[PDB]
């Protein structure tokens, strides 16, 4: 046989686990049956007895083994003859895609494949939250199971565990109406497992008992207690009449889970964003503008607030991968409004100078072939197919160090793709982009932050309270979270980027009417005005209680 030494170990490297020398070890060798048919490690924290092999997590015994489904068993599962697959069900295939893509090169306890795991769960819930009648439903719960019981195995290993939002937070409510797609007037109702849930068939007993109970209400009060405290549950429902709760005022319709959302949100964070408008003193030059989402209801600390903060910043690209562009291609630099409104009581030089030189290097396509490989990152926004480029960004890095013939190669390629589009001047213009046209733009800012620094303009600020920040944040996320996205933000003004931001917090609905600027074009000019009238429509609403 094997010994066992000090969690505990096995030598014929298979690690043991007890939560720790009591007599649960009685119950460990019972379950374990043979020799070189062990698991890598093996826990046991609860009634629950848990393995972790290879990369996946697994919860073996309670005293049932759990494939999660893959997209094509998910499209034979959720299959429903004559319906077009609608944008939730789509939400849904992709998270699911993009999961299943993350336990490739990870294990499914890290927190990569963690926060994918959960936002499959969120857009499975919201799939049945906001469409209860689909016949997709069944599938889901199938794929609900799964995910659950997914969660389960994983999170006694994720590190942090902070990510994962408790199942009675407010939160895990509010993260559902995104795929849920709910009409506004549609009513929260409970089930027969005080879930949150919509009616739609049975509806009718429901539709007409809706002062009869307030369950539903002292869940959603009871959710947002648990979460942020009775302190901000008692004061932001102290100041939420019955109306703003429910259209017809009685229980809580989707519009009133809404005004307990951002309720919260001014409670937490009184300013939801800060407009940026950098006027220099005027070389026939550019203005600039930026936003900094705030941090509404988020409840996060230390480093992952600075994380989430240079995230939540809003420009022509999103600001993590600017930077880390920055360096590639050349390989601490701050690329904030914020980081130059100080005033004169507490790099930009070799980042500078290095720009210039790499912007009139590539104002002279073969030496672009070197630059994409070596950021693919940026290589992606490009329009060209993963498949096609891969190959070679692989015999860049791994083969070899036989180089210059594979950039040489690869350039063949890139133009064998243009002609087979049947758009090659489109191709072309669309490399050309991503791979100059982002330098110049990260050069012409940073010369903006130098001409701020030696006194040559005004950064403008705005405070805009009042807005959606969660909405807000989303808008942001969409904008800058895929190589296409962010190939769009490069093809446009900030300002314009900036006033799709805050129209998605809520803009419009703020000022009253629709706001065009001249033309139909942002400029900065156009959002400080815009910005203004924001400011000028949250006063004239604050006031009027
Ligand atoms: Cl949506
Ligand atoms: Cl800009």
Same mark, same amino acid.
């Given at each position: 046989?094997?010994?066992?030494?000090?969690?505990?170990?096995?030598?014929?490297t298979?690690?043991? $686990?007890?939560?720790?020398?009591?007599?649960?070890?009685?119950?460990?060798?019972?379950?374990?049956?043979?020799?070189?048919?062990?698991? $890598?490690?093996?826990?046991?924290?609860?009634?629950?007895?848990?393995s972790?092999?290879?990369?996946?997590?697994?919860i073996?015994?309670?005293?049932?083994?759990?494939?999660?489904?893959?997209?094509?068993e998910?499209? $034979?599962?959720?299959?429903?003859?004559?319906?077009?697959?609608?944008?939730?069900?789509?939400?849904?295939?992709?998270? #699911?895609?993009?999961?299943?893509?993350?336990?490739?090169?990870?294990?499914?306890?890290?927190?990569?494949?963690?926060?994918?795991?959960?936002?499959?769960?969120?857009?499975?819930?919201?799939?049945?939250?906001?469409?209860?009648?689909?016949?997709?439903?069944?599938?889901?719960?199938?794929?609900?199971?799964?995910?659950?019981?997914?969660?389960?195995?994983?999170?006694?290993?994720?590190?942090?565990?902070?990510?994962?939002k408790?199942?009675?937070?407010?939160?895990?409510?509010?993260?559902?109406?995104?795929?849920?797609?709910?009409?506004?007037?549609?009513?929260?109702?409970?089930?027969?497992?005080?879930?949150?849930?919509?009616?739609?068939?049975?509806?009718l007993?429901?539709?007409?008992?809706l002062?009869?109970?307030?369950a539903?209400?002292?869940?959603?009060?009871?959710?947002?207690?648990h979460?942020?405290?009775?302190?901000?549950?008692?004061?932001?429902?102290?100041?939420?009449?019955?109306?703003? #709760?429910?259209?017809?005022?009685?229980?809580?319709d989707?519009?009133?889970?809404?005004?307990?959302?951002?309720?919260?949100?001014?409670?937490?964070?009184?300013?939801?964003?800060?407009?940026?408008?950098?006027?220099?003193?005027?070389?026939?030059?550019?203005?600039?503008?930026?936003?900094?989402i705030?941090?509404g209801?988020?409840?996060?600390?230390?480093?992952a607030?600075?994380?989430?903060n240079?995230?939540?910043?809003?420009?022509?690209?999103?600001?993590?991968?600017?930077?880390?562009?920055?360096?590639?291609?050349?390989?601490?630099?701050?690329?904030?409004?914020?980081?130059?409104?100080?005033?004169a009581?507490?790099?930009?030089?070799?980042?500078?100078?290095?720009?210039?030189?790499?912007?009139?290097?590539?104002?002279?396509?073969?030496?672009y072939?070197?630059?994409?490989?070596?950021?693919?990152?940026?290589?992606?926004?490009?329009?060209?197919?993963?498949?096609?480029?891969?190959?070679?960004?692989?015999?860049?890095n791994?083969?070899?160090?036989?180089?210059?013939?594979?950039?040489?190669?690869?350039?063949?390629?890139?133009?064998?793709?243009?002609?087979?589009?049947?758009?090659?001047?489109?191709?072309?213009?669309?490399?050309?982009?991503?791979?100059?046209?982002?330098?110049?733009?990260?050069?012409?800012?940073?010369?903006?932050?130098?001409?701020?620094?030696?006194?040559?303009?005004?950064?403008?600020?705005?405070?805009?309270?009042?807005?959606?920040?969660?909405?807000?944040?989303?808008?942001?996320?969409?904008?800058?979270?895929?190589?296409?996205?962010?190939?769009?933000?490069?093809?446009?003004?900030?300002?314009?980027?900036?006033?799709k931001?805050?129209?998605?917090?809520?803009?419009?609905?703020?000022?009253?009417?629709?706001?065009?600027?001249?033309?139909?074009?942002?400029?900065?000019?156009?959002?400080?005005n815009?910005?203004?009238?924001?400011?000028?429509?949250?006063?004239?609403?604050?006031?009027?209680?």
């Amino acid at each position: 046989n094997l010994l066992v030494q000090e969690g505990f170990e096995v030598r014929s490297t298979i690690l043991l $686990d007890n939560p720790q020398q009591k007599s649960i070890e009685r119950f460990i060798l019972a379950n374990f049956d043979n020799f070189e048919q062990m698991p $890598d490690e093996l826990f046991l924290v609860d009634n629950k007895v848990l393995s972790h092999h290879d990369g996946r997590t697994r919860i073996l015994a309670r005293k049932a083994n759990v494939e999660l489904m893959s997209v094509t068993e998910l499209l $034979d599962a959720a299959h429903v003859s004559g319906k077009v697959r609608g944008e939730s069900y789509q939400q849904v295939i992709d998270a #699911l895609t993009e999961y299943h893509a993350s336990t490739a090169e990870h294990a499914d306890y890290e927190l990569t494949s963690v926060e994918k795991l959960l936002n499959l769960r969120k857009q499975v819930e919201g799939y049945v939250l906001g469409h209860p009648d689909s016949g997709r439903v069944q599938a889901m719960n199938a794929l609900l199971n799964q995910v659950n019981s997914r969660l389960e195995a994983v999170s006694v290993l994720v590190v942090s565990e902070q990510s994962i939002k408790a199942h009675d937070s407010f939160s895990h409510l509010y993260d559902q109406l995104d795929n849920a797609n709910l009409k506004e007037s549609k009513h929260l109702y409970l089930d027969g497992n005080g879930d949150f849930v919509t009616k739609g068939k049975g509806n009718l007993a429901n539709i007409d008992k809706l002062g009869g109970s307030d369950a539903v209400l002292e869940k959603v009060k009871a959710a947002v207690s648990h979460e942020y405290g009775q302190v901000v549950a008692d004061t932001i429902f102290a100041g939420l009449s019955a109306n703003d #709760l429910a259209k017809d005022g009685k229980g809580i319709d989707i519009a009133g889970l809404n005004k307990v959302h951002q309720a919260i949100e001014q409670h937490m964070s009184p300013v939801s964003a800060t407009m940026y408008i950098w006027k220099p003193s005027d070389h026939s030059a550019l203005g600039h503008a930026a936003l900094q989402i705030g941090q509404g209801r988020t409840q996060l600390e230390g480093q992952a607030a600075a994380d989430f903060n240079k995230q939540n910043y809003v420009s022509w690209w999103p600001l993590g991968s600017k930077s880390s562009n920055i360096r590639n291609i050349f390989n601490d630099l701050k690329l904030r409004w914020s980081d130059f409104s100080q005033p004169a009581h507490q790099g930009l030089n070799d980042g500078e100078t290095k720009l210039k030189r790499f912007v009139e290097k590539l104002n002279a396509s073969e030496g672009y072939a070197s630059v994409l490989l070596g950021n693919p990152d940026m290589l992606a926004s490009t329009g060209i197919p993963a498949h096609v480029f891969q190959p070679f960004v692989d015999q860049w890095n791994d083969t070899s160090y036989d180089m210059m013939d594979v950039a040489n190669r690869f350039a063949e390629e890139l133009q064998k793709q243009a002609q087979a589009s049947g758009d090659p001047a489109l191709v072309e213009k669309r490399i050309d982009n991503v791979v100059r046209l982002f330098a110049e733009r990260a050069l012409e800012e940073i010369e903006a932050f130098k001409a701020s620094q030696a006194d040559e303009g005004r950064v403008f600020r705005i405070n805009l309270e009042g807005l959606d920040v969660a909405a807000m944040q989303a808008e942001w996320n969409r904008l800058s979270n895929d190589p296409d996205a962010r190939y769009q933000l490069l093809t446009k003004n900030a300002s314009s980027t900036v006033a799709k931001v805050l129209k998605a917090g809520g803009a419009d609905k703020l000022i009253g009417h629709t706001w065009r600027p001249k033309f139909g074009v942002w400029t900065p000019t156009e959002l400080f005005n815009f910005g203004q009238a924001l400011q000028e429509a949250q006063l004239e609403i604050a006031a009027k209680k």
